């Protein structure tokens, strides 16, 4: 059983398992990140966007490891590492990352 490479543009849209492990190669630089909430990081925010906001891993991409969070509302808007977490209105598919 093995993590997912995905191509550091994926988001939290396509990445919703209960838990699921995920590689990011490449550096990933500062080319798209808006990012949704902070720790309960809505779907549409980057997996780049969210593990960098979070601090799992530098602006350089690696190994990373997503955990589903149920639908959340009320939400706040935090920046970490020169990216930007917004609030939403209600987004019933959210996220929380950390590392391996």
Known sequence: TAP???????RGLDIRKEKADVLCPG???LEEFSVYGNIVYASVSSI???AVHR???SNSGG????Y???????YSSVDANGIQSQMLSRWSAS????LE
């Open 55 to 57: 601090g799992v891993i």
């Open 4 to 10: 997912i490479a995905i191509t550091c543009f994926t």
């Open 95 to 98: 996220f929380t990352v950390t």
């Open 27 to 29: 550096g990933c630089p």
């Open 63 to 66: 190994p990373v490891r997503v």
């Open 48 to 50: 780049c966007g969210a």
């Open 68 to 74: 589903s969070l149920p639908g959340r509302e009320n």
